[PDB]
């Protein structure tokens, strides 16, 4: 799911690097440190929408750089167990379906695919189809999945999906 939320982030800067215009520097440093990052707590930080406020620089004897607290609005992507999303299939394998939802990867275990969808390695582009050739899922197809679990390995989140429920699958 995509959200527009308010996040915080601290920018540390020694005087030497304030640049001709500090506010701009703080702002340019922020975009660079947060955009593209991901956390388990908020998920993928897609982009910084707005910088609400730049707090008064903090000078605590001991540090030689100043800490500028920053409040900003961002677009984040945070999947949840139980959420239904449209995904793009990136690869068909005998092990399952590798898809991609925006910046997050999602794996559909073959074990989580209805039984009518036999696997066909011999098919031109490998695929999953009904013996009826009626419904066919292959690379680059858009499918609907229900996210069964999420994981966070090295600040990056990925999910596991299923096609077991009604109204899921080929779109």
């Amino acid at each position: 799911m995509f959200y527009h939320i308010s996040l915080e982030h601290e920018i540390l800067l020694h005087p030497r690097y304030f640049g001709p215009n500090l506010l701009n520097t703080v702002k340019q440093k922020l975009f660079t440190e947060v955009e593209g990052t991901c956390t388990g707590k908020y998920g993928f930080v897609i982009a910084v929408t707005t910088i609400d406020n730049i707090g008064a620089g903090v000078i605590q004897p001991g540090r030689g750089f100043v800490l500028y607290p920053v409040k900003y609005k961002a677009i984040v992507f945070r999947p949840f167990k139980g959420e239904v999303v449209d995904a793009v299939v990136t690869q068909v394998n005998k092990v399952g379906l590798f898809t991609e939802i925006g910046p997050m990867s999602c794996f559909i275990s073959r074990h989580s695919i209805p039984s009518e969808m036999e696997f066909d390695p011999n098919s031109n582009p490998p695929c999953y189809k009904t013996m009826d050739e009626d419904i066919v899922i292959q690379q680059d197809d858009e499918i609907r999945l229900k996210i069964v679990g999420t994981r966070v390995d090295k600040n990056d989140i990925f999910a596991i999906g299923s096609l077991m429920d009604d109204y899921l699958g080929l779109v």
């Binding site: 995509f2 959200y3 593209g36 707590k41 167990k81 959420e83 925006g102 609907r144 429920d165």
Partner: protein, 128 residues
Amino acid sequence: EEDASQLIFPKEFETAETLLNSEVHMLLEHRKQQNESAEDEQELSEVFMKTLNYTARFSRFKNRETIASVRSLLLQKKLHKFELACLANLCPETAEESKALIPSLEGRFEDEELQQILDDIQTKRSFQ
């Protein structure tokens, strides 16, 4: 601990507002225009790019104003921020399907009413 099918979300995402893939696309499109123009700024991230394409590829309401009408239409219905965005993104066509995909919707409205909302959404859809 969390589960969207029961609108059980973590604390952090409470004071937050949901975004339709279409709105996301519009916002990201603007951020790109800014990065493009006004040099002295690194190319955008892979995360951005992938989100820019995914979002576009699934945007059902290609017009800015249209998007607003979809938002407001649903807005005035006893729906959760999650449920709203989800209905706009997935555009189910029948109440049954609707309830299946978003079980939290169960018991909120009469099939009749729920089917009205679904049908209205379809109307705003900027088909192709």
